[PDB]
Ligand binder design. Structure first.
Ligand code: ZN
Lengths: 60, 303, 49, 49, 145, 84
DNA sequence: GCTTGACAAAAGTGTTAAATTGTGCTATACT
DNA sequence: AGCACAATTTAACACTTTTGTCAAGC
């Protein structure tokens, strides 16, 4: 900026256990004149891991 | 060194045209087509023309075609400037360009100098459409008619728009409502949109084996079955021996064991020279005889 | 790879029949030439498809 | 080509290479290459060798 | 399939050899119908050329049993034979313009370049439309004029 | 059961296409050559689609009336005459 | 041991109405 | 892109032939 500011992050969609069960990704949507939704944003568990499509991944 | 570099070095040699030149070439082209058609029509209608004038019209064609070629070679830059935007969408840059030139050719054939509009105005439409229409006909390994490529892109557009409004991927119901079609249709559509994957890819670690290696050939013969099947044919042969000579043949023909093609009651009755009902009666008795424990117990294992 | 070859080959017939300029036609033969090269030994000349 | 165009012929692409191979006497091109003389100690003969 | 052959020989495959091998020219860059998922006609996978998908079954189906083999269906143009032929039969593509075999052009040393005395950097400019080559010349007319 | 039909291509090559004895024999057959072939015996009844492919003349006639074209040609001819 | 005429279902065959599919086209100017 | 229009394929269907089946009978 200038070409966007104050991006938002809603509470997580589903719980870690609920994500691993339904095979979905642990993410929280983010937002950013016209308001824009940028997409579901993955989140890191307390164990320092991510749930990407129901599987527990770790970034090295 | 590089080919796309060469094509640009040649189109860049041609001199761009102003508004006045375009109309002159446009005129010469239309004069070339009518002159050529007039000479052909005069022979059909049994008419002649002044010698000197007739030879003048013939030259109008040579000058007309030079006008056509000259008009195209000047606006080749326009084709490229439009072809840059469609790269990386599954079509080589050159292929986009050549398809653009195809569209460009048509624009020249339909351009109208009397309207007074700059040529690039009307050529951009055809060149643009020529490229897009090409992608719908060639970009996909499994071709999809343009009307389906049309709706697929429309659905993705609604999806992307609905995605931006709701903040969540729209469900089939939401996506079907906004698109005024059945949710099952969007599903059927979403199956068509999927493109294939490369067998020559390497799913195994460090090129241990390509993906194609893991594909079963389910049609391949099964050794154990070809042997059991062979033993079944042999076992039925014996069972056929217990039946009547004619009765065994009826069973063969009815199921086509001998010639591999079954026969209707009439056809079977035609070879034995009796009614088609008589064959129906005979067959039923064969099955009863076949369901007898002595003859039938041996074949249960073959399921 | 065959698709790229048969596509460019067909487009060439189209251009030949359309009496198109030699720049466009020659540009097609060059494109056809490179498609067969890629079909046989892709990458042996220029960037691979 | 504008002048002298009727004295020669020229082309591009594989078809031109196809022509050069057409009018190509294999035996004639060999005998002139059979020259084990014409110096030869230099690579010029090896280039032909 | 005797399993005892004495020799094994190669050689440049001529256009005729290729045409003789093929069972028909593939005319379209199509694979299979996006709906039926069956091989498109005149294109790649065309049963009319490469072979049927099912044993002793033509494309349309007017011939299905093993009763008739070695014949061709007068509707879909599919020969009724084993589906394996789909792995032994080849097609071909008639080119609207000749093309150089990359193995003899870019293969170092240039087999064609050595065959006509054209440097590989010069020959590359010819077959890729970067320069003109003199194919013929009229010596008598050039000398008389 | 096998019917043996022979077709003739435009370039002069001939092909044998076995068919079933009972079924109809086509008049034209897509041959190994890649070209269409007409059968030698049996009469052809070849109903050519007869669709005339649209040409540049068709696209010009549908915008210029023959009079407008005639006037243009006079301009061009009156121009070539003047050049002499 | 076989055939008849009934009747039905099943398989075709010709005639029509969707639907699917392929092609053409869009004129501020745009190189 | 989107739509118009023509061409072609697919469906739909009515209708006829074919095929299997029951009963009663020679
Ligand atoms: Zn068939």
């Amino acid at each position: 900026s200038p070409i966007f500011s104050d991006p938002r992050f809603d509470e997580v969609k589903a719980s870690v256990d609920e994500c691993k069960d339904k095979d979905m990704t642990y993410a929280a949507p983010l937002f950013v004149s016209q308001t824009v939704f940028m997409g579901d944003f993955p989140m890191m568990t307390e164990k320092g891991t991510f749930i990407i499509n129901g599987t527990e991944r770790v970034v090295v | 060194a590089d080919s796309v570099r060469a094509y640009l070095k040649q189109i860049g040699k041609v001199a761009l045209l102003n508004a006045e030149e375009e109309v002159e070439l446009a005129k010469r082209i239309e004069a070339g087509l009518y002159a050529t058609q007039k000479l052909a029509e005069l022979a059909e209608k049994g008419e002649k023309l002044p010698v000197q004038q007739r030879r003048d019209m013939q030259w109008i064609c040579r000058d007309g075609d030079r006008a056509k070629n000259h008009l195209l070679e000047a606006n080749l830059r326009l084709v490229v400037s439009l072809a840059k935007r469609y790269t990386g969408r599954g079509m080589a840059f050159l292929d986009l360009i050549q398809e653009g030139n195809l569209g460009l050719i048509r624009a020249v054939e339909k351009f109208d100098y009397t309207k007074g509009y700059k040529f690039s105005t009307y050529a951009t439409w055809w060149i643009r459409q020529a490229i897009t229409r090409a992608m719908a006909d060639q970009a996909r390994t499994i071709r999809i008619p343009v009307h389906m490529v049309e709706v697929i892109n429309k659905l993705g557009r609604i999806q992307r728009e609905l995605l931006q409004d709701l903040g969540r991927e729209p469900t089939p119901e939401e996506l079907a409502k906004e698109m005024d079609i059945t949710p099952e249709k969007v599903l059927e559509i979403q199956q068509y949109a999927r493109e294939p994957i490369s067998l020559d890819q390497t799913i195994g670690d460090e090129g241990d084996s390509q993906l194609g290696d893991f594909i079963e050939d389910s049609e391949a013969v099964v050794a154990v079955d070809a042997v059991s099947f062979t033993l079944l044919q042999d076992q039925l042969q014996s069972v056929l021996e217990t039946l009547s000579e004619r009765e065994a043949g009826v069973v063969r023909l009815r199921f086509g064991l001998t010639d591999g093609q079954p026969r209707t009651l009439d056809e079977i009755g035609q070879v034995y020279g009796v009614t088609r009902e008589r064959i129906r009666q005979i067959e039923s008795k064969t099955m009863s005889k076949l369901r007898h424990p002595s003859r039938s117990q041996v074949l249960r294992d073959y399921l | 790879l065959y698709r790229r070859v048969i596509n460019r080959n067909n487009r060439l017939k189209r251009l030949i029949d359309l009496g198109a300029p030699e720049i466009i036609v020659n540009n097609e033969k060059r494109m056809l030439q490179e498609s067969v090269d890629a079909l046989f030994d892709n990458g042996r000349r220029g960037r691979p498809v | 080509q504008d002048r002298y165009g009727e004295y020669f012929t020229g082309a591009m692409g594989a078809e031109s290479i196809k022509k050069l191979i057409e009018n190509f006497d294999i035996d004639a091109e060999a005998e002139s290459l059979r020259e084990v003389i014409r110096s030869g100690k230099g690579q010029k003969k090896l280039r032909a060798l | 399939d005797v399993n005892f052959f004495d020799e094994l020989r190669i050689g440049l495959a001529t256009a005729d050899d290729i045409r003789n091998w093929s069972y028909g020219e593939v005319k379209k860059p199509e694979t299979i119908n996006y709906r039926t998922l069956k091989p498109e006609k005149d294109g790649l996978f065309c049963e009319k050329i490469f072979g049927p998908t099912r044993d002793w079954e033509c494309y349309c189906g007017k011939y299905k049993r093993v009763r008739f083999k070695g014949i061709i269906c007068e509707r879909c143009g599919v020969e009724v034979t084993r589906a394996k032929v789909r792995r032994e039969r080849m097609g071909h593509i008639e080119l609207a313009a000749p093309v150089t075999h990359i193995w003899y052009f870019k293969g170092v040393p240039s087999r064609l370049g050595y065959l006509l005395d054209l440097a590989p950097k010069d020959l590359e400019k010819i077959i890729y439309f970067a320069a003109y080559v003199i194919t013929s010349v009229d010596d008598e007319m050039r000398h008389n004029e | 059961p096998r019917q043996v039909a022979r077709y003739r291509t435009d370039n002069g090559e001939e092909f044998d296409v076995p068919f079933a004895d009972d079924a109809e024999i086509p008049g034209t057959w897509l041959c190994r050559n890649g070209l269409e072939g007409t059968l030698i015996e049996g009469d052809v009844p070849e109903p050519k689609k007869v669709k005339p492919p649209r040409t540049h003349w068709d696209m010009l006639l549908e915008r210029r009336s023959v009079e407008e074209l005639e006037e243009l040609l006079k301009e061009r001819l009156d121009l070539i005459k003047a050049k002499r």
